[PDB]
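Predicting holo structure, 2-acetamido-2-deoxy-beta-D-glucopyranose bound.
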Amino acid sequence: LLVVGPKFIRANQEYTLVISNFNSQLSKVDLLLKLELSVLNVTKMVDVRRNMNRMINFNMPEDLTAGNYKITIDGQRGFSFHKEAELVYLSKSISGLIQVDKPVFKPGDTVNFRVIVLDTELKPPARVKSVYVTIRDPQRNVIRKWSTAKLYAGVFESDLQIAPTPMLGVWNISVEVEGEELVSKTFEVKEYVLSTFDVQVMPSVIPLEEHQAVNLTIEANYHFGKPVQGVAKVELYLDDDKLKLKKELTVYGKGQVELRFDNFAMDADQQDVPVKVSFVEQYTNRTVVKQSQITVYRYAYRVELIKESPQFRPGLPFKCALQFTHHDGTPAKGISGKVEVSDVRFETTTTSDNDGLIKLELQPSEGTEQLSIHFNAVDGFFFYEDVNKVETVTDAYIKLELKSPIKRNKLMRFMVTCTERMTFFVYYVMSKGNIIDAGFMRPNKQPKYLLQLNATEKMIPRAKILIATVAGRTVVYDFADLAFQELRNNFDLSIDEQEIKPGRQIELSMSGRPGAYVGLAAYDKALLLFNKNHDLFWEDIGQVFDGFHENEFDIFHSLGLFARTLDDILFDSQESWLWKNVSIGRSGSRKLIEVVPDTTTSWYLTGFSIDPVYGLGIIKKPIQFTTVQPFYIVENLPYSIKRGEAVVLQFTLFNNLGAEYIADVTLYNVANQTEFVGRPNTDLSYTKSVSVPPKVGVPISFLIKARKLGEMAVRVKASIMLGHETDALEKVIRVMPESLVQPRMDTRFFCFDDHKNQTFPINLDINKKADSGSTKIEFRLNPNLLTTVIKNLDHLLGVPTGCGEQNMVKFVPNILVLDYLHAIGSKEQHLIDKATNLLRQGYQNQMRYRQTDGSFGLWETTNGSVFLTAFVGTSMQTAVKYISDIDAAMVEKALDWLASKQHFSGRFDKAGAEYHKEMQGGLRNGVALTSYVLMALLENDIAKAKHAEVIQKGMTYLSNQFGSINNAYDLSIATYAMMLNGHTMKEEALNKLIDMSFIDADKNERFWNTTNPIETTAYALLSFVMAEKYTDGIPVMNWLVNQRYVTGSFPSTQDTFVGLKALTKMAEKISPSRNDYTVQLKYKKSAKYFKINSEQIDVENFVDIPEDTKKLEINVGGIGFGLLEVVYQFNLNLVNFENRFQLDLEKQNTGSDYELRLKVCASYIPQLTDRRSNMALIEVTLPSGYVVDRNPISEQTKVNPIQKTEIRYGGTSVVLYYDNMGSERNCFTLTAYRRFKVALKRPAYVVVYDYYNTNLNAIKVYEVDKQNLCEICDEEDCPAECG
Ligand SMILES: *[C@@H]1O[C@H](CO)[C@@H](O[C@@H]2O[C@H](CO)[C@@H](O)[C@H](O)[C@H]2NC(C)=O)[C@H](O)[C@H]1NC(C)=O
Ligand SMILES: *[C@@H]1O[C@H](CO)[C@@H](O)[C@H](O)[C@H]1NC(C)=O
Ligand SMILES: *[C@@H]1O[C@H](CO)[C@@H](O)[C@H](O)[C@H]1NC(C)=O
Ligand SMILES: *[C@@H]1O[C@H](CO)[C@@H](O)[C@H](O)[C@H]1NC(C)=O
Ligand code: NA
Ligand code: NA
Ligand code: NA
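Done. C-alpha cells:
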C-alpha cells in the first residue's frame, strides 16, 4: 500500500489524500482514516480495490486555530497496517521575504532593505495593500517603525541611517501582517577596531611535479582593507624525508615566494604538502600563523565519469561523458587521449571538447556484465571506472520526461521510463500545496509508458507532478515542474560578454513582462565570505519559487507532502553597488547602464522580478565576474602631526598587469603646506620612481614637514607606462599645535528697536604670557544666536561627551533649534531638515543609556539616575513634535520609574553614581534635584497632565523648604519650576533670587556667582522671561552671551542646554520684527563693512580676520538684532599645571624602542567638605606617530573603576571616564606602539579634569625617546647635517 497526502493544512482548502493499492494478495483492502488540540475529529470507513487508487477529500472547517494535527491510517480486518503523519497547520496564505543590501554594516552607513510579499500564486496579494515593519537594535529598542508601509508590486523598500556611535550587535528587521509576524531578518553592525589582521596563503600557479617547486602568494590585510607590513617565515614540510624547507621575506601587504624541491617524485598522482606561515607585524611584532595543505599534482588535469544513471541497463544505450577539469575546477579543453571500452569493442581517439567533455554513447548487449571505461593519454595519464548493470533490489529507478510543451487546455505528454518492466506506476499532481489529480496506471509489463494528462485550471499557473512505483521492495520516484510559460514571468538578466573593468561602465540587459518590477543587487563575495553561515537572500528567494526545505533531500518534504508505505518497503533517495529597482517597460526589455566601482573584487549579481499579474520571476543562477584594478597605490598615514616634526609618509604600490613596470609617484605641495626635507620651499611637487613587479606590494615614501596648522592635503599621483595606467589619492593629516589651544570668545549683542547709532570699542591685549607665538584672532558678525550653533550642530563642544548626560548634545540642541525656528515661523527649510535629521540620529544614540529598569544611566550599563531619567524622558516627549520615531511606551516606562522614586514628602534623592554634585547632592535637602524633576515635567504638557500627582507633591515640598533655600543654584531651579507651575510663591522666589544677584557695572552685566554660574544665571533668565522682566533681563543676557564657547554653545553640557534655552527664549521676545543695519569694523588703518537687511538671515557668514593689532572699533547703525564676536586662538606654551588634582606620569621600561608603556595616576585634592570631584575624565595624548592597540589599558586600580574607555583620532587619543575622584590613587597603564617614523617630535601630555568644573584640572607633559632625523630618512633626501 502507498499513502500520499499533503503535509500542510489550511482553513478552507480541500485536503485530498491518495491511497494506492498495488497489493496482489487480496481483491480489496479496508481502511480506517482518523484525522485529528481537539478541534478536528473526522473519520472515514474507506474501501480500496486492488490495482487501483482511491482519492479521499476532506473539507477543512473555516474556524481552524493553531494546534496539533494528525492523520492515521489503519488496516481493518485481515490486514495489518498502521501508518501516521504529522500535519502542519498554516495560518496565512501569504509568504514574506526581506532583502538587505549587506549582512554587516559599520557605524557610518545606510541599511537598505526590501520587503517582498507574495501569495500562494507567487504574486502580490490582492488583499494586502500595506505592511507593518519595525527595526530594533541589539537590545530591542524600536528605532524605526513603518506602521503602514505600502506595497508596490508586492515590494516595500526603505532605509535606515546608522548612527556614528550605534548599538553594536544584531539588529532585527521585523515584518508584520494584521498584527502577526510574517518575516523577520537580522543584520549586524560591527566596529572596524579589529586591529588584528588575517593572512592568506595560496599557490600563485598550480603546483606540478615537473616544476620541482612551489610558488606561493602570501597576503596580509586588516579587515577594513589596508595592507600590513611584516616579515613572513614560510615553512614547508616533507615528512617522508624528515625535511623542512624554510624562507623569510618582507611582505608589504602581498608577497611571492618560491620554494624549490630536491628530488621530488610522488608515489601517487597527487601529494599534499603542509605549509606554515608566521606573519610578524612590523613594530608591534603581532604574530598571526596560517597553515594549509598544498597539493602538488602530476598532471594539469583531472577526469571524472559523469553518468546519465548510476548503473546501466543490459540491452539499452548508456549515455555518459568523461569530464576533464583543471585543478581549479574550470573545464580543460583540447585534452587528447584514447578512450576504450573493451567489453563492447568500443574505441575512440579524440580530444576533450570546448566544455571539457568527451561524450560517450555506449551500447551493452544483454550479455554484457559491466562496462570498463579506460582512458589513456600519451603523457602517461590513465583513468578507469567500471559501470555495473542495474540490480532491482538497490539500483532500480523510474524517470519522467516531458515530451511536449505545457499549455492551458492541452494534453501534457510524458515518457515514463523504468528499469523494470512495469505492472503499475502512479502519478500525482499538486498545485498550491494540494493534490489536484492522481492516477493508477497499468503498463502491460513495459519499461516505457506514454503518460497523457489534460491540464486543468486548478493546475494553473504553476503545478508539479510526481510519479512513483514499487521496484523489488523499494519505492522509486521522479518529479517535474509543470510551468505554463504563457502565464509565467519570464525574467532574465545578462551582462555584456566582455571583461568588466573598474571605473569603466557596463550595460545590464534584462527582459520579462512589460509592467514587471525588477529588483537588482550586487554583493562582493568578500562580504559574503565572513558571514555566509546565516541565511542568504538568494537561497530564500529561489526556494520559494519552487517548494519547501538537515539530513538528506526528501522529495515529499519539498513537494509539500508525506508518503507512507508497508513496513518492509523502503523509499529511494565597500559601498553598495547596483542596489537599483527598475521596470521592464514597453518592449518587454530594459537596458540599465552603470559605472563599475574602482576596486579589485569579485561580484555576485542578482535580479528578481514581480509582475502584478504574472508574479515572481527569477534568474537561474547569480551572475559572477571579477573586477581587477591594473594599478593602485595605498596610503598609510598618521592621524596627526605637529609643525616642525619630520614625518615619513609611507605608501604601497600594487601592479596587476602581466609584467614589471617602473612606477612614478608624485607628492604635491598643496597651498604651501608641505616642505620636502632637503629641497626648497618653492617646490610644488616631488617625484620618485620605483620598480613594481606583478602582484607584489612595493613601498614608497616621502620625508616631509608641515608648514601650516589645520588640515594638510596629502595629494598623490602614481602611474606606470607613461601614464597609460594611473592612480591618485586625496587624503588628510591633521596638523596640530603643541598645547591644546583653548579659544576664548568675547561677545557683545545689540538690540535696536528705533533707529540707533552705537560705537563699540574693543581692547584685545589681555592675551599673552611668556610665550604665545602669535595668537590669531577673528571678528564675526552674526544675526542670530543659532547661526553658528546650527552650523556646528554635530560638533558643538571641544570636550568629549561619551556619558549618558553629555550625550544629550546630540539631541537637545536640535530641539532648541527646531522649537525656536518654529516660534519665529522660519521658512529656511535646509535648517529645519538638518536639526530634524540629527535629532533622529541622536535618538538612536541616546537609547544606549536606557537600562533594563526602563530608566537612563550615566553608562551603557549602570543603575539609573533620576536626573538623567527626568532629563531624557521629558526631552524625548518634547521631541515627539518633530520626529515620529520616538517610542511612546518607552517614554512612559521611564517617567513611571521616575515617578516611583519620589518620596512621600515630594522630594527626589539621587540614584546611581554622583557625577554632578550640585544637582544630585543631598546636602541642601534635595532642592536642586526636586526642582529639576518638577521643572522638566512642567515644560511638557503631556508629561504635566500624566504626572499631576508628582508635581503636586513636589510643589508642596518646595513650599515647605522655601525658607531654607539659601543656595542660588537650587533657588534658580526652584523659582523656574514655580514660574512654570504658577505657584503662589513664584513672585516671592524670584525676588529672593534677584537679591542674591551680582553686578558688573562697567560691563552692564548681571549674573549669579555659584560654582556653576552659567546654569544658575540661565535658569534665572528663564524666570525673568517668564515674568516679562525684559529690561532688567538685558544685563543678564549681556553676561551669558559673553560666556559662550566659540561654536555658539557654552563650553559644557548642562551649561549649553539651560544657557541656549534661556538665550533663545529671551531673544524671541526682545528682538525687532526686522533687521536693517550697517556694521563698520575699523582697525589700525582699514575698514570693513557689513550690511544685514533680511530678518530671515541665518545661514550667513560675516567672518573677518584682524591681524596682530592692539585695538578695535565697531560702529553699528540701523535697526535690529546682532552679535558682535571676537574669537581668540591662543598658542600658550605646553607646561605642567595642577589645580585641585594630582597627576603623575611615568614611562615603564618596555625593552623596545617601538613600545610605550605610560603609567598614569590621578587623584583629587580634597579640601574641607569637598572630598570628591564631579565626573572626571582623563585624556591621554600620544606623541606623533604612536598608536594604541586594541585594548590599550592594563593594571587599572580597582577602588574606583574606569567606567568608559574611548579611543579617538586614529588611536592617537584615549579618554577615560570616572564617576568621580577623591584622594585614592586612580592608576592605569597605557600601551602604545610607534607606527610611523617621526623625528624632532614635540612632547605630548596627559590631562585630568572635573567635567562640570573644568577649572579643577591637572596637566603633565611627557617625552618619548627622540628619534634622529639621520635614522629617519632614506639616503636620497638626507640633508646636509647628517652621515
Ligand atoms: C523603484 O521603486 C519605487 C517603489 O519602491 C518606485 O517609486 C514609486 O513609483 C510609483 C509610481 O507608480 C509611485 O506611486 C510611488 O509613490 C513611488 N514610491 C516611492 C516611495 O518612491 C520607483 O518608480 C522605482 N524606480 C524606478 C525608476 O523604476
Ligand atoms: C526578530 O523579531 C521577531 C519578533 O520580534 C523574533 O521572532 C526574532 O526572535 C527576532 N530576532 C532576534 C535576533 O531577536
Ligand atoms: C615560480 O615563480 C618564479 C618567479 O616568479 C617564476 O619565474 C616561475 O616561472 C614560477 N613558476 C611557474 C610554474 O610559474
Ligand atoms: C619586535 O622585534 C624587533 C626585531 O627583533 C625589535 O627591534 C622590537 O623591539 C620588537 N618590538 C616590540 C614591540 O617588542
Ligand atoms: Na540622580
Ligand atoms: Na565678563
Ligand atoms: Na623624535
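The radius of gyration is 40 Å.
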